[PDB]
Design a protein around this nucleic acid. Structure first.
Ligand SMILES: [Mg+2]
Ligand SMILES: [Mg+2]
Ligand SMILES: [Mg+2]
Ligand SMILES: [Mg+2]
Ligand SMILES: [Mg+2]
Ligand SMILES: [Mg+2]
Ligand SMILES: [Mg+2]
Ligand SMILES: [Mg+2]
Ligand SMILES: [Zn+2]
Lengths: 140, 214, 72, 64, 102
RNA sequence: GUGAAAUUCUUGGACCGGCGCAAGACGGACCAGAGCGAAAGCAUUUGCCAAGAAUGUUUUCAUUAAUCAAGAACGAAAGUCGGAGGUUCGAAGACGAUCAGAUACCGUCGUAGUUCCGACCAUAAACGAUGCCGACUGGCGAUGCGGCGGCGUUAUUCCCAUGACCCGCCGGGCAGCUUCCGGGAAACCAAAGUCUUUGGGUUCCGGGGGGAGUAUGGUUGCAAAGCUGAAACUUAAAGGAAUUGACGG
RNA sequence: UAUUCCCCAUGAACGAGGAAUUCCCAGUAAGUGCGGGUCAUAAGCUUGCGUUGAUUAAGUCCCUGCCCUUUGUACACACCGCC
């Protein structure tokens, strides 16, 4: 800092906001950051971009690493504060967020980012569209 | 080859004059080149803003939609697009041993902004009540729903968007419904749950200036 | 494939009075099985119950209450 | 790139874990911001009251 | 022999109840038979509450809750240790477990 | 996506984020040992159509009733026929795994089907594994509908109503707890009681285990199949409910 | 078909051991000798004794099992069961 072309021309006390869409499912986590509208993407790092083991893409450590990389990039683009939109797979499938929401949100806060509003944006159906297991479910 | 963030310039998003906090935030867009323009790729963006970020003393669980309509240089001027409650508030109100009554009405303001308003209300346990449940019978639910639809229709049907939004800011409609329905079954958590925009006429720019001006 | 009845008959032939204790017969049969076989999924208990079915359920053998005898 | 080495002082021991009773949970505190304290898994005999070193500071420990 | 007086479900005055899907295996369970559970857990996971609180841009912000309703089949509730086998006189006890308030 | 992976999709830019559009399903949370229906079954709003239980009644008729071979209406799901539609799931099928094998369980795709209209089929652990009608025999607290009666609180409105609550009573319901009523082989059951102290009315139905709901004839159906239904031969037990041990991935 | 011992010659494998697997927590393990038994002749065995003298641990129920409670059962020659 400062570039000065990359980044808005702002004051020194007030802060500029973005939206961090954290899709924390099982099998992966996403630390997507957009602008306020959500139409412009600033950065997107996923858990599978940091590990090469294919079973720990959903581990908390990989979510922490993704959150740190996202925080560094958004900091050098001038974004200083974030609204959080937490999300599970939802719809037909599970509504509990995965193992990587924890460390991603913690690492965003601890990496030097200001936290705004937190909200759950998991897709909740009004009883739609039959799920896959068969009638007896998955008999593991 | 080059990073795309050297081709972007930052704009400012302005709320209408219903709210006292006029500045929403900053959005960005690629600079105009070729045949694609900055302004047409910038219009139609939607900014879901909390009400506490637009009014300095109002509630936080209500949020507004605020689609952008015109560009005035470094400013994106917005107009009302819809209202909704947060997920946790709506999930917090719904609980067992009480009846939920919901109603919806399609209705047009005077200037041609056909809306769909959703209402919700829950039956209230009395303070000296010792029965577990507070359940309205079906005819009580039906006339409560009828009152909700008639109140919403009479409130928005004879107005235009400015004072309709000014009614939605403190939710005076929900208080009117709750006050009116006490003689059927007392309701406590009465809100306008969601406002949806269905049709907008012709984009009079002078109207948008009037909304953003005095 | 290991031949159970043939190996048991061969052991009973090389025995005094065609007679052997169940323990010695079991020891020799299991050692033979481990030294000729090609299949590996079979367990120790499955082999034990297979051997018990081989000796107690054959018309050519008799059980004199702790032993196996070759009948004619 | 990594956060530096952090030293942590061990407050009360929270029992044994690790499916053979090989690790302990310790509830360390960071002795720079003493108010900040986390649960951690330690191998070796621990004896609450002494100082650890943390290469990667903010991981977690699951509560027993 | 008949194990329970209700037949393992709350179906007293009707013929048919609508089935639901178990939340972690997607087995069809009748709605009265399922093991239901309501979870009002915090989003911000109070082991990490202070970092979020000090990093917040507001002064007085209350953290949102997460509201999920879970449905289990009998097998998943037993295997995930939501419920356990009980003795006969312990079986016919309908009180919820104590809230472990202190 | 999984225990782990691979089949699979991806710089021709998938996944993720935004704004829209279309399609067909399905009606979450509220939703309960709650309601309704002869059962099967029935849950988004509004409107229309005919129906119904219970309650109230100093209303009418005056025995018009109960149960019922033959006969008749309805009857989940799957299945069949014809026409619309085909989102999602997904018998068959293909592949990837796992395995000694794996025509399986797990994963990816996917036909018929799942949806609607019209016509068949008549079967389910169609279960409360408990015929229907009537009488008698303990207690208690709730709950749903209707009626009656009471201190007070609350709403419009300032009053009488009318709603929300509170305290009871009566009737008909779905149930619960408790009890040395009594019964039962017991588990248990206020009905499975009022049974050697054996008789209120009536329908269907069992007679050791198999063979076998098979063979054959008849009959219904487009079919699949349904209904009715043996015998030769074989066998000393097969079962129920409790007890003690042993074993339990 | 060398009892054991002594002397001079002879001078083989073995360069720390695959899959498996045993014993052990304090004067313990391990090293090191010395008595007794057997014994006419005799200890690479065993049973005792001192001597030198540690590493690691003060835990858990994961593997192999044991005890107690609840639970399921078509087993009772009792899961190496029954089918
Ligand atoms: Mg992946
Ligand atoms: Mg299992
Ligand atoms: Mg049983
Ligand atoms: Mg049924
Ligand atoms: Mg059908
Ligand atoms: Mg598919
Ligand atoms: Mg069909
Ligand atoms: Mg017979
Ligand atoms: Zn399940």
């Amino acid at each position: 800092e400062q570039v000065i072309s990359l980044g808005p021309q702002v004051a020194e006390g007030e802060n500029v906001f973005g939206v961090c869409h954290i899709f924390a499912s099982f099998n992966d986590t996403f630390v997507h950051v957009t602008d306020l509208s959500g139409k412009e993407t600033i950065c997107r790092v996923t858990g599978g971009m940091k590990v090469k083991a294919d079973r720990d893409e959903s581990s908390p450590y990989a979510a922490m690493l993704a959150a740190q990389d996202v925080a560094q990039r958004c900091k050098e683009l001038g974004i200083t504060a974030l609204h959080i939109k937490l999300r599970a797979t939802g719809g037909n499938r599970t509504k509990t967020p995965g193992p990587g929401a924890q460390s991603a949100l913690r690492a965003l806060a601890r990496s030097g980012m200001k936290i705004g509003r937190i909200e759950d944006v998991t897709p909740i159906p009004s009883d739609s569209t039959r799920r896959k297991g068969g009638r007896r479910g998955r008999r593991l | 080859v080059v990073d795309p963030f050297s081709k972007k310039d930052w704009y400012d998003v302005k709320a209408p004059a219903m709210f006292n906090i006029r500045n929403i935030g900053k959005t960005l867009v690629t600079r105009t080149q070729g045949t694609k323009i900055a302004s047409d790729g910038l219009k139609g963006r939607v900014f879901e803003v909390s009400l506490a970020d637009l009014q300095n003393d109002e509630v936080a669980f209500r949020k507004f939609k605020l689609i952008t309509e015109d560009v005035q240089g470094k400013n994106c001027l917005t107009n009302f697009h819809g209202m909704d409650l947060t997920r946790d508030k709506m999930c917090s109100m719904v609980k067992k041993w009480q009846t939920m009554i919901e109603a919806h009405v399609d209705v047009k303001t005077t200037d041609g902004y056909l809306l769909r308003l959703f209402c919700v209300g829950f039956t209230k346990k009395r303070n000296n009540q010792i029965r577990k449940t507070s359940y309205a019978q079906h005819q009580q639910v039906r006339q409560i729903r009828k009152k909700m639809m008639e109140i919403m229709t009479r409130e928005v049907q004879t107005n235009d968007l400015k004072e309709v939004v000014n009614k939605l800011i403190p939710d005076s409609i929900g208080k009117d419904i709750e006050k009116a329905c006490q003689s059927i079954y007392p309701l406590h958590d009465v809100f306008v749950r969601k406002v949806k925009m269905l049709k907008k006429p012709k984009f009079e720019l002078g109207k948008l200036m009037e909304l953003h001006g005095e | 494939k290991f031949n159970w009845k043939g190996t048991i008959k061969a052991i009973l032939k090389q025995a005094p009075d065609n007679e052997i204790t169940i323990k010695k017969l079991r020891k020799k049969v299991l050692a033979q099985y481990y030294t000729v076989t090609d299949e590996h999924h079979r367990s120790e208990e499955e082999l034990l119950v297979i051997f018990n079915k081989k000796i107690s359920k054959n018309p050519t053998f008799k059980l004199l209450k702790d032993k196996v005898k070759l009948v004619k | 790139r990594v956060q530096p080495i952090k030293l942590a002082r061990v407050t009360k021991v929270l029992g044994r874990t690790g499916s053979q009773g090989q690790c302990t949970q310790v509830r360390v505190e960071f002795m720079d911001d003493t108010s900040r304290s986390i649960i951690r898994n330690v191998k070796g005999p621990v004896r609450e009251g002494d100082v650890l070193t943390l290469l990667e500071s903010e991981r977690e420990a699951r509560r027993l | 022999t008949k194990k329970r007086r209700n037949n393992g479900r709350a179906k007293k005055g009707r013929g048919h109840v609508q089935p639901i899907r178990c939340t972690n295996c997607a087995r069809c369970v009748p709605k009265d038979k399922a093991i239901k559970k309501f979870v009002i857990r915090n989003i911000v996971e109070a082991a990490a509450v202070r970092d979020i609180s000090e990093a917040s841009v507001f002064d007085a912000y209350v953290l949102p809750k997460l509201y999920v309703k879970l449905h289990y089949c009998v097998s998943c509730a037993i295997h995930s240790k939501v419920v356990r086998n009980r003795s006969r006189e312990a079986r016919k006890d309908r009180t919820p477990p104590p809230r472990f308030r202190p």
